[PDB]
Amino acid sequence: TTALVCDNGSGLVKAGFAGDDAPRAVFPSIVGRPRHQGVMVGMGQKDSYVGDEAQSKRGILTLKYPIEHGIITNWDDMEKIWHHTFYNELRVAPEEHPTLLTEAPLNPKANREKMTQIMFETFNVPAMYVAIQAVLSLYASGRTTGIVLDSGDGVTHNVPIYEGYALPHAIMRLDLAGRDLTDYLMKILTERGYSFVTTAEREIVRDIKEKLCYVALDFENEMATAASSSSLEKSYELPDGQVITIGNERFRCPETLFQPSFIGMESAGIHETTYNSIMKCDIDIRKDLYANNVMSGGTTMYPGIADRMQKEITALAPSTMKIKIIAPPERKYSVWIGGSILASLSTFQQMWITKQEYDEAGPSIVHRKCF
Amino acid sequence: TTALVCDNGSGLVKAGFAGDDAPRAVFPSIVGRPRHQGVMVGMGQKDSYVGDEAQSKRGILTLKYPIEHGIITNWDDMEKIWHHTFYNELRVAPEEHPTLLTEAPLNPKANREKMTQIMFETFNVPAMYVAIQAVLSLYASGRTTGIVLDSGDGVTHNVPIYEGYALPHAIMRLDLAGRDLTDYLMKILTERGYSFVTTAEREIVRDIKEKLCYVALDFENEMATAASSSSLEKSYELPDGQVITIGNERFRCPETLFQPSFIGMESAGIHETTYNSIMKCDIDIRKDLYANNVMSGGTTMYPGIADRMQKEITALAPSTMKIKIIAPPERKYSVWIGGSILASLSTFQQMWITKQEYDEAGPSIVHRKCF
Amino acid sequence: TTALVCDNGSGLVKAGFAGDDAPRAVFPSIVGRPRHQGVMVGMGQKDSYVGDEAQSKRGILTLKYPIEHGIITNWDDMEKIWHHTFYNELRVAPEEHPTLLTEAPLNPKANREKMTQIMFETFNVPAMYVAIQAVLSLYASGRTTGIVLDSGDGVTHNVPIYEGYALPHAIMRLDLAGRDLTDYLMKILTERGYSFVTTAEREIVRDIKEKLCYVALDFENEMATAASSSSLEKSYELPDGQVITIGNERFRCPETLFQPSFIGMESAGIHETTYNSIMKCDIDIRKDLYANNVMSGGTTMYPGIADRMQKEITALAPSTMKIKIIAPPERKYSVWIGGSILASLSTFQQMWITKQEYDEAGPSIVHRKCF
Amino acid sequence: XXXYXXXXXXXXXXXXXXXXXXXXXXXXXXXXXXXXXXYXXXXXXXXXXXXX
Amino acid sequence: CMFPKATDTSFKNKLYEQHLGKSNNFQKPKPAKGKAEAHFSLVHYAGTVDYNIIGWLDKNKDPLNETVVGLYQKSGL
Ligand SMILES: Nc1ncnc2c1ncn2[C@@H]1O[C@H](COP(=O)(O)OP(=O)(O)O)[C@@H](O)[C@H]1O
Ligand SMILES: Nc1ncnc2c1ncn2[C@@H]1O[C@H](COP(=O)(O)OP(=O)(O)O)[C@@H](O)[C@H]1O
Ligand SMILES: Nc1ncnc2c1ncn2[C@@H]1O[C@H](COP(=O)(O)OP(=O)(O)O)[C@@H](O)[C@H]1O
């Protein structure tokens, strides 16, 4: 037989067998339900909808979002999603493979315990594992040491990994991910005051986040150009309906990462967090990390982040020593890709959970057995 | 000299010098024009009409409404209104005073820029300011911390203010104000099916909103009483013509605030919005706000809102901690009153815009200079 | 005239005349500043805040913490604090008394030199002294020989003192103090995953550290009880808001002192450090110290430390010889109390620095003249 | 309304904005207040360099 | 004083920013005998004289109501 991996890194959800280059297909983890009396009697009433099916159907559906802050909000909804994904895309039965789970690090045990409990009981599945993002990120990026930044749909990360080991004290974990940024966007957008608030309306922004964003090289200087020029300003359509045209409101958005005033918090930002977390970690290693600096997924997609990051580190580093960052093309997929690699090696046969343990001891097994 | 404040909180419009207890008089901001060939040749044709003059004249006039959703629709009309108000009520010349402007928060810059541009150019006026509602609401209510709910003629608000500072991220802003509710009313009213739609006909409802409304204590239980009793039902005249008598249709109306299905939207309502916006804001402050809870203006006029609100918070709060709300008598005037206080303090002499700046820099000045 | 002593042992800050039993009042040495636009124009803007005033005001303020690792971070801030303390609590003028300063031992000269420089210049003060914690600890505890453990807000200490003399080689100095432990606490706390990170949120933990902690008698056995029982688990409120209920997460915390893996370092811990530092010191004295063993301040407050410490020493000691430890009630105050005693004796009149020397030679004077 | 509202709102709300935000002044001030590594490490390097 | 529910100390502080640097002839009073606290020190044709604060601000406060005389106007007297 053969081995199968779910990505539940948030945003669209990624699933695929070991050794395929890329997951078969991918789904937002939107969940949505009707909003109005069902008045075509000819229609079959289905009360819950998910995935691109919903993405089409959206308008009378209204959304629930089953993961806040990387924490999965409502289990039975997940179970709906999960069941759908297996049967509809995968045409797969729980017995068929070991299955591998993808976790925010340093987050409450409950997600571990219920996830495993459900999936061994509700699904019945040969072998289970839950793995921390950064490990995959290294394996895919193939440098045994490193530090990773990956700010997905969900909670945003700093982990230094040294070769072959964790520094769990070192690690920083942040709820700054693009969704909340986007919801700040609206509080921007009312300046131009084309204005709409609901969940689907919020996801419409996601497209603009694809298309229209780019990273500020320098904030002051950008403001000076903002006074000078309109090339900074670009014209974009409603997905249907109007043309819309957007100024500094594009570039201002990512700066939140550097300055989370605009929705206001203190953690001194991605880069200062990173250098902080470095200065926690010990002295000699540091050069390697100055060399090996790695980024991935949802926010990183933006053009230019790595450059201003390097500018920031050149601010904070003693300039004397080499600095560079890695910005691979495939970052948003990176995790599941690494998961595939993770699946490949026979050592997990030593390492998987088996049904037997789940019989003989509880969810408690995990927290010893896995990281 | 002396200092003068316009309220342009929507609905009737409120204007008065610093230190008077209440504005001299107040006007709806209706605008209206002829509908029919003018056939008394003896009549002077005036093509636009405003204020109680129109309120008398209405029938052949037809209305335009120059503020949607708190956003002022058509500038030159405003200018008509504004000019009229000064000269006819106020007997005032633009030079005579500093003038203070009253704004929906978090709404498009354009209202700022054109308002100032016009009023410095078209009127020529010593000093200008635009101020956010909640600030006045606190000053009048005199508790330096707080959260305010004021759902006027126009767009409906949540702002927590802490003492001496803004939390602009915290803030929620909603187009749920009584006008749109009233227009829903007609879609109610056709059940009894005495039915009329035009603008003046819509304003006729406003009287009923004065007289006939009261707040549902409990919705289910009210329905049970609705089955039992007719004391719930009261008898009311046309302003002229018929007696009209109205059932649950009265109390059902305010529930929209709690459930904006009936004209259907999702934002989970006043109270759930409020507690949401709290849970955004940080942990320690919260008790104060549980203590200090403040409401004003158009919707709040209804008897009973505060009670069911408290019922709702007792639902959502951990019951352990004190809760109360403030419901002052004067809420509908509150804003302009607070504005008077705002006018009083010499610090605005430090703070006003002056003509000089408007000379030396554009409308842009405001958005730095004011909140 | 009369003589006055500042405690700048970190945490709340302690100040009082010679011969009073306890300092007049005490302040955290928090410093904090605004976070948000100041939007009550009526408010006076003060840009920096300290002390219980801030402790009330906190929410929009954000904290800076002017002492890391017992090293005082930012001088002018200190000067603010210091000035405030004199005038507001003490109603005292710098001329009024000799003043006595309280120092982490074995730490960089700079704190000496600037502290003295400022306080002789910025304040002008008859006589100055800076004194090492352990000396006071003995004087208050009144046993001329000893070893002291006092792990305050700040860097954590071992000093053997023999009667009348120092063994500066003997001494061990550690950055393990309760603050950093507390920040580890959050990385615990996300297991239950009620989770908040900012400075004020971090200080909220301090209360729990007061209330909820107690010392592990035996770690394995405690885990066995953890499997058995919930009496280990207690229920506690938010300072306002929720009830929170906490398991082993309470007792696990102090073990860090015994095992600084959990935030990971090597120094083999309090007790093994102590016995190490003993085995450095010479052979005959040792029995006395086995008898005379003394502990104080922030961490020691916990019930039970002395017991497991004794268990540890009975592990490491040859059991043959007597062992005991002292655990006075008043330990957290102990230092300033001892300082009062230190102030009392006329010999410091021989010993104080005077302005004259500061005239005739630099800060350099101190490092000869004082320990 | 399609004439009345749209004539103004499409025309003028086209061009909405220019400022060096005072709120961004707030952000700048805050970030200055909360560049811990800047203030603390500059101060410590400055002092600690001098050893007599 | 229309800023509510607050304390003369607030204004003390506002003095200390506002005048106490700026306004030469006004002064923080020195220590002197006879008095628990004195807060203002300034210079006059009579010489130079120094004065003190109790929270009294509201004492100058003027409330008004029409109603009170409004109805008294009805009354017999
Ligand atoms: N074309 C794009 N450009 C920029 N950001 C995008 C794009 N497509 C998706 N994103 C963002 O990337 C994230 C996709 O989720 P993901 O990065 O997988 O989160 P997680 O790390 O939780 O798995 C979301 O924040 C989504 O809005
Ligand atoms: N007697 C009344 N009872 C209930 N509501 C009223 C009464 N009179 C006016 N209103 C409503 O109060 C609002 C008056 O405008 P206002 O509250 O000043 O709005 P804004 O907050 O925009 O200034 C309108 O919604 C009006 O219909
Ligand atoms: N009730 C309490 N229980 C336990 N620890 C406490 C309590 N109150 C304060 N502390 C801790 O004791 C320390 C107080 O500072 P202190 O011991 O004076 O440090 P220093 O030795 O630097 O003077 C801090 O670590 C504080 O968190």
Please list every residue in chain B whose beta carbon sits closer than 8 Å to the beta carbon of residue D9.
73
Please list every residue in chain A whose beta carbon sits closer than 8 Å to the beta carbon of residue B107.
190, 193
Task: Please tell me whether residues A167 and A311 are part of one structural domain.
Answer: yes
Name the DSSP class of E30.
P
Q: Which residues of C touch B (CB under 8 A)?
A: 34-43, 45, 58-60, 196, 198, 200-201, 204, 237-243
CA B240 to chain centre: 28
Using an 8 Å Cβ cutoff, are C156 and C176 in contact? yes
E28 touches chain C (CB under 8 A): no
Pocket test for ligand 1, best of A157, A180, A206 (most atoms within 8 A of CB): A206
Q: What share of chain A is helix, strand, coil (3-state, %, to 5)?
A: 45, 20, 40
Q: Nearest ligand to the C-alpha of residue C153? A: 3
C-beta A11 within 6 A of ligand 1: yes
CATH number at residue A284: 3.30.420.40
Task: Please tell me whether residues C265 and C343 are part of one structural domain.
Answer: no
Closest residue of A to C184, CA-based?
A169
Identity of residue B226: A
Task: Please tell me whether residues B346 and B328 are part of one structural domain.
Answer: no
Q: Which stretches within chain C are classed as H helix?
A: 51-57, 75-84, 109-121, 133-141, 178-189, 199-211, 219-228, 249-258, 270-280, 286-291, 297-300, 305-316, 331-344, 347-351, 355-360, 364-369
Distance (Å) from CA B153 to ligand 2 centroid: 5
**Ligand 3 atom 25 nearest Cα:** C153
Task: Please tell me whether residues A255 and A214 are part of one structural domain.
Answer: yes
Nearest-atom index, ligand 1, CA of A332:
17
* Domains: count for chain C: 4
| Paired strand residues for B114 | none
Using an 8 Å Cβ cutoff, are B115 and B101 in contact? yes
The structure tokens listed for C356 are: 């004259």
Q: Do A169 and C187 touch (CB under 8 A)?
A: yes
Distance (Å) from CA C302 to ligand 3 centroid: 10
Residue B165: which of C34, C200, C243 has the nearest Cβ? C34
Task: Please tell me whether residues A301 and A352 are part of one structural domain.
Answer: no
Task: Please tell me whether residues C212 and C260 are part of one structural domain.
Answer: yes
When scoring C49, C63, C65, C74 by the number of chain D Cβ atoms within 10 A, the one with the most, hence best to mutate, is C74
**Of A249, A270, A291, at which residue does a domain stop?**
A270
Task: Please tell me whether residues B128 and B6 are part of one structural domain.
Answer: yes
Return d(Cα C60, Cα C62) in angstroms, integer: 6
**Of B270, B305, B323, at which residue does a domain stop?**
B270
How many CB pairs below 8 A link B and D? 32
Task: Please tell me whether residues B225 and B162 are part of one structural domain.
Answer: no
Task: Please tell me whether residues A199 and A217 are part of one structural domain.
Answer: yes
Residue C191: which of A109, A266, A267 has the nearest Cβ? A109
Distance (Å) from CA A151 to ligand 1 centroid: 8
Closest residue of A to D22, CA-based?
A262
Q: Which residues line ligand 3 (CB under 6 A)?
A: C 9-11, 150, 152-154, 177-179, 206, 209-210, 297-298, 301, 332
Task: Please tell me whether residues A15 and A115 are part of one structural domain.
Answer: yes
Using an 8 Å Cβ cutoff, are C146 and C293 in contact? yes
Please list every residue in chain D whose beta carbon sits closer than 8 Å to the beta carbon of residue C36.
26
CATH number at residue C265: 3.90.640.10
When scoring B135, B283, B323 by the number of chain C Cβ atoms within 10 A, the one with the most, hence best to mutate, is B283
Residue B169: which of A36, A197, A263 has the nearest Cβ? A263
Collect all residues with Cβ–Cβ distance below 8 Å to A41 and sequence separation of at least 6.
Answer: none
Q: How far is B71 from chain D (nearest CA, A)?
A: 10
Using an 8 Å Cβ cutoff, are B304 and B312 in contact? no
- Of the candidates A144, A75, A127, which has an alpha carbon nearest to the alpha carbon of residue A357? A127
Q: Is the dihedral of CA C224, C230, C236, C238 positive or negative?
A: positive
Distance (Å) from CA A298 to ligand 1 centroid: 3
Collect all residues with Cβ–Cβ distance below 8 Å to A50 and sequence separation of at least 6.
Answer: A27, A29, A30, A31, A32, A80, A81, A84
Q: Do B266 and A199 touch (CB under 8 A)?
A: yes
Return d(Cα C191, Cα A173) in angstroms, integer: 13
D27 touches chain A (CB under 8 A): yes
Helix, strand, or coil (residue B221): helix
Q: How far is E45 from chain C (nearest CA, A)?
A: 32
Total Cβ atoms within 10 A of residue A368: 7
Nearest-atom index, ligand 3, CA of C104:
22
CATH number at residue A56: 2.30.36.70
Q: Do E2 and B21 touch (CB under 8 A)?
A: no
Distance (Å) from CA C177 to ligand 3 centroid: 9
Task: Please tell me whether residues C265 and C223 are part of one structural domain.
Answer: yes
Which chains lie within 8 Å of chain E at 3 or more CB pairs, if any?
B, C
Characterize B209-225 residue by residue with b for buried, 16 or more Cβ atoms within 10 angstroms of its Cβ, and e for exposed. Answer: beebbebbeeeeebeeb
**Of A255, A270, A285, at which residue does a domain stop?**
A270
Please list every residue in chain D whose beta carbon sits closer than 8 Å to the beta carbon of residue B368.
19-22, 25
Q: Do E5 and B344 touch (CB under 8 A)?
A: no
For the CA atoms of chain A, what is the radius of gyration?
A: 22
Return d(Cα A49, Cα A88) in angstroms, integer: 13
| Distant-in-sequence contacts of A190-193, Cβ < 8 A, 24+ apart | A190/B106, A190/B107, A190/B108, A190/B173, A191/A249, A191/B108, A191/B109, A191/D16, A191/D17, A192/A246, A192/A247, A192/A249, A192/B108, A192/D13, A192/D16, A192/D17, A193/B71, A193/B107, A193/B108, A193/B109, A193/B110, A193/D13, A193/D16
Q: How far is C305 from chain A (nearest CA, A)?
A: 25
D46 touches chain C (CB under 8 A): no
The H or E element spanning position B308 is helix B305-316
Return d(Cα A129, Cα A146) in angstroms, integer: 23
Which chains lie within 8 Å of chain A at 3 or more CB pairs, if any?
B, C, D
Which chains lie within 8 Å of chain B at 3 or more CB pairs, if any?
A, C, D, E
CA angle A303, A308, A313 (to 5 degrees): 140
Return d(Cα A191, Cα B108) in angstroms, integer: 4
Q: Which residues line ligand 2 (CB under 6 A)?
A: B 9-11, 150, 152-154, 177-179, 206, 209-210, 297-298, 301, 332
Return d(Cα C143, Cα C160) in angstroms, integer: 12
Task: Please tell me whether residues A1 and A106 are part of one structural domain.
Answer: yes
Name the DSSP class of B190.
T
Strand order, beta sheet including C31-33: C49-50, C31-33, C62-64
Q: Is the dihedral of CA C86, C91, C95, C96 positive or negative?
A: negative
Name the DSSP class of C346.
T
Closest residue of B to E66, CA-based?
B21
Which range marks the domain in which residue B160 is found? 135-181+271-333
Exposure of A297 by Cβ count < 10 A (0-12 exposed, 13-18 middle, 19+ buried)?
buried
The structure tokens listed for C221 are: 């056995």
Distance (Å) from CA C26 to ligand 3 centroid: 12
Identity of residue B30: I
Do the two chains A and B touch, given a threshold of 8 Å on CB pairs and at least 3 pairs? Answer: yes
How many CB pairs below 8 A link B and C? 77
Helix, strand, or coil (residue A172): strand
Q: Do B345 and C42 touch (CB under 8 A)?
A: yes
Return d(Cα C158, Cα C279) in angstroms, integer: 13
Characterize B58-78 residue by residue with b for buried, 16 or more Cβ atoms within 10 angstroms of its Cβ, and e for exposed. Answer: beebebbbbbbbbbbbbbebb
**Ligand 3 atom 4 nearest Cα:** C210
E56 touches chain C (CB under 8 A): no
| Distant-in-sequence contacts of B200-207, Cβ < 8 A, 24+ apart | B200/B58, B200/B59, B200/B62, B200/B63, B203/B30, B203/B63, B204/B239, B206/B182, B207/B239
| Deposited experimental method | cryo-EM
The structure tokens listed for A31 are: 């969940």
